[PDB]
Amino acid sequence: YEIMLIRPKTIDDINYVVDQVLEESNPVILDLSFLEKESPANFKLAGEKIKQMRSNYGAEALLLSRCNDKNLIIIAPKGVSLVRK
Amino acid sequence: YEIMLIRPKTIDDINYVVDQVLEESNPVILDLSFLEKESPANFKLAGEKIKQMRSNYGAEALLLSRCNDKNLIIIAPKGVSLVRK
């Protein structure tokens, strides 16, 4: 399919991430660093939406790296399993 | 399908990464930090195998984050497109 890479800057960008995972069943490599730096409130909202996707839609969300101006998480929809070796 | 997460420590682990992308058509989120620190030669070999997968098998390989003890690259097989918004 497609794996989407997104660095959201607005609440609408967050809702686009949600739609990609839930409606399109595309994994998203999400960079939360802009929200974390510039809008604590929208950073918190993004975390709440990730919580909702995990709890209510069966998505996985795995921290990859939070370092040097990036805060990278992979969100995988139900049907694309993360497998760590 | 499956997205594999692997931090190789040996040449055999590298060849397993290759097999996942080429034979199983699974994307791999690859952490090269152990090779980079502990074996420059095997780090270089991993780079050569990534080059071969891109050039000869149509794979994509996109740097995600090299920071604070991680060197993360996503390798996507032909048929799983990376899409950046």
From TrEMBL, chains A, B:
<protein>
    <recommendedName>
        <fullName>Cell division protein SepF</fullName>
    </recommendedName>
</protein>
